[model samples]
Target: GSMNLTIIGSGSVGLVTGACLADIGHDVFCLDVDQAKIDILNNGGVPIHEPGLKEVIARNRSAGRLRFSTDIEAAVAHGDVQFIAVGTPPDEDGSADLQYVLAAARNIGRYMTGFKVIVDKSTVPVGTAERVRAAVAEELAKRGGDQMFSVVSNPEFLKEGAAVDDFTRPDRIVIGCDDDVPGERARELMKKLYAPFNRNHERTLYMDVRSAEFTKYAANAMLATRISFMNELANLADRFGADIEAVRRGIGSDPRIGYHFLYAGCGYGGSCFPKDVEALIRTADEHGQSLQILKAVSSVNATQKRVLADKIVARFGEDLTGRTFAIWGLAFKPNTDDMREAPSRELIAELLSRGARIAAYDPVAQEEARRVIALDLADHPSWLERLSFVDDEAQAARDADALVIVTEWKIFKSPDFVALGRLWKTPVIFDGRNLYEPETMSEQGIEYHPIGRPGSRQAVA
Candidate 1:
């Protein structure tokens, strides 16, 4: 028998979770205070893009497995399992802003007529579960209510581009429940809810509430650290005339270091890495310790975001008054419209301040890119006018001083290198993602500059 499940937000995480749960035979009701998001879902539209998500949503909705609403009371009463999948955006002090999560908790407590399993599906710090419990208790007390609920921590590990696949076929599922009687009830219900995922093997790791919360931040920290580590070495490779890409292959083959997250690029950004890293650091500071490695990781990433711009400046000089640089890819990474803290923002601002014009293109992120880039250049309206988000890759490259590759979109990987020389005025390319072969570009008479490879010096072919 399927249980009624409710997700408190309609953003990427909430929507995906709701849809996937419904697909697995659960009756899901996704509640959002924002009417616009609900409207979109009800009308068969998804506000965000994730491959295969739309189809899954459509199938589930058609089969009467999923629903969307703005009704708080109905949502609270409907689900035996209430998932607070709302956002925990970073506060000004770099700590998680738990306003949305708490709001969801309070609403659930205010309307719950029976026992409910309250799961924290958001990436929050340790001790947040206890705070959620207290918030629920306070609301129940005010209403003269004595309804019981177990606050559990179950952080999501969904990647932006591959959220649906990640959710459906999660490599590991972390569930942290308390050891009390109410907690045992929660554990049973959660185990039943997630039984579908465990059909092949046990993917769920049951732990204490605090440990589950810590795991999410710790995993992100390790991945971010690996990124910054390779980026640091990539810089050294650039200075010492070594091929970091080749070095990457050499080390990645050692089995100790897998090839994942080792690619040196502009920087890591989006909704998670930058926010979680800073939040974890802030948590450490509150407890009288500092994460020295994370401190360096953040600094390295910030500095790395400037790497492409630095390369452009080194070759073209600081005064880019009469130059135009063609940019490919604007989103933090490929296949999503999210541009939050994307390295392209840093690169674009630098080029614009120096009076360089930009024509950028992405397969899917142009509209969202336009929205964020305008905000970044709000102080300098004139500089905003200098940036143009174009329609296609070739259009972006046409007649520019050099071609700059920002995000490593798949379409950008294997372009016609021979004809690319004719697109830019100087046949020069500054690649941040290191997508192309430097030797191949040189063979085609196109001057190429990639991060940490041999023959990366200034040369006009």
Candidate 2:
């Protein structure tokens, strides 16, 4: 059955949620404060580069299943299920600044003419649903408190690379609402909205509201922990002459410690991991407690981002005068143009500071990398002059002092080494992601300084 949906904040979460819901025959209205972002969508362009997203949006727009607008009141009045998908910018104290979220909640109260099921699709801090309820309540009270509504917690677990697929065919769906009458009504409506997705088994998990809000953070924190844990293990493996890739397979074989999130590289960074981890820590501290393991996790990741920079510095002295390095993968990860807390930015900053020039390339993130990098190097604009966002990998590696693989994009795996060597100024590599075997690199006649692996590395399948 088709549903009327209004999604606030047409960023990644809002836009994707609206688009996919619309693609499934739901009438979706996506709202954003940024008029330019709205205009881009209305003009049939996406503001961000996500794999398969543009096609979904365009198709849904053409089918008249989705629409975009900037009018808050119109958005609030449009749908029975109004989704609050606003971005939560982190405060200076690492706690999420929820001003925008609160604004959305209040605006909904101000304009909703009928019963509305308010779903929190944003990754908000725990107990924020109560805040949203209170915000809506205050506004409703201002207008004599007649309209009925229920707050539901439905955080997203979509990954950047494959968000559309993830949303359409999620491994699990979580819905947290109240047990009372309106909450039950919300649950039924939500079930109808996602019924099309539950094809085989019952993947939807029903829980209370607070736990649902808490679930997404814990999931992200656990994932971040696994990343930092492996990175710490990898750093130690390098020292102990043990190969981490082999070590990963050894530990990953056990049923208890599954294989996902075990790959170690230049630390974990993105919108979710950093923001959720920080907010969780701040929330814990505000309640007069400390998360020791998470604190270490945060610390290890900060250090790990610098690991590749340290490797480059070690190879070409502390002073990187007259050196040029080609960097592969500028985004935090492949298949998306998200550079938030990307390890490449750290590497680029370190290299530029020590007088090294860089030729960087990413399959999809160059334009965004340029924008963010320009802001990163705004104080010293000339530092940006040393960085080149090339179109091709070979062009980036051409005549460079060394090649640094930062993002582990699939294209970087199984590269044509002979050609790269023929083009490289020096046939050396700083492998951040352990993309290639050291022995294979040696066989190819290139110096492959991989993380946590030696010349006689164990075989990885």
Candidate 3:
């Protein structure tokens, strides 16, 4: 029989983890404090957009292996293993805020009827396991009971767009625990919980809890470093009349410097790279060590996020008093509606501040984009008057001056250049993802402005 699992907090990570585990025959209960979100889940509705996640949730729910609840006590008593998958949003100082994690730990300690394996599935800083353990121990002591439990760090490494696939067929699974007897039991239970995905491969790597916590930050830091390095190179390439894409190919041929995260774009704007990179920098500062490379990486990304807007200002001349631009994508990336730190936010805000009008469209993130912008620009209501979200891509470009591509969605890859050219006041396109070739755009009679490329107006300027 599979283990009865209870996942605390029904956010993106928690929902995906619970759904996938239940699909593999384990009975999973996902608990959240939000009654509305739980009601939606119980009625076969997914609160967030992720590829293949709805299908997984539906299948598991129909099989009677997955359940959702807002009752914390009932959820605490139903599970042999508890997964703390709450949010660790970045604090003001760039360190992860652990109030939710600690609260979940205390809830488990106070209401759990028996010994439960508590796993830290949230991305947190080093030594967070100790804090979780202390919180749980304090709660147990308040009840005058010496409850035995183990806190293990098993950080998730899921991409926003492909979270379901990443969870079910992960490249590696790191399980971190202590060296004590209780730690061994926790490890065994975790391995059993993941045994479905662990078959036919050696995917699980056991380590100390602190190392596992550090690994998540380390992985994101390295990826962010690569992105910033390439973006800087792309800027240099444009300055020197060189193609960063060609340079990318030349360097990516080397086995040591493979082509992952090597694309030079406007900048990365997702939940993981931005927050985790800064959090690691904050961690280094706390240790009295300065991470010079990561600091540069963070700086480069901030500058890179404004690269497209800079190109626009250069072309249209800073005071865009009457310009109208159409944005193709709104989400941070494609296949997901998460706009935590999307580049489009900075780009649109900059243009709107300079008195420009924008018509934006996204396949699945139009509502999310509006909500994000409304909350962000609450003080500056004038920006909302200039921003409009259209129903389709064609409608977005119908009455605009130029077309700007932010997210590389599949639909935007091969748009009808003739239609875009006819719809715009000026036949111009700003390619943030380098989605089109300059020669093709020139042949089609549209001025193309792409990152890390030559023969564009930015290159000449």
Worst 10 residues of 3 by lDDT: 452-461
Q: What residue runs in model 2 are displaced by over 4 Å at the alpha carbon?
A: 455-461
List CA RMSD, all candidates. Answer: 1.3, 2.5, 1.6
Candidate 3 — what's its lDDT? 0.90
**Candidate with the larger TM-score of 1 and 2:** 1
Question: How much lDDT does each candidate structure score?
Answer: 0.91, 0.89, 0.90
Task: List, residue by residue over 134-222, the lDDT tens digit for candidate 1.
Answer: 99999999999978999999999999989999999998999999999999999999999999999889999999999999999999999
lDDT of 2: 0.89
Q: Alpha carbon lDDT of residue 106, candidate 1? A: 90
Return the candidate ranking by TM-score, descending. 1, 3, 2
Error of 3 at 459 (Å): 7.3
Ranking by lDDT: 1, 3, 2
What is the Cα-based lDDT of residue 416 in candidate 3? 82
Alpha-carbon TM-score of each model against the true structure? 0.98, 0.96, 0.97
Instruction: Tell me how candidate 1 scores on lDDT.
Output: 0.91
What local lDDT does model 3 show for residue 263?
89
lDDT of 3 by residue, 129-198 (tens): 9999999889898998867889999999898878898998899999998888888988889889888777
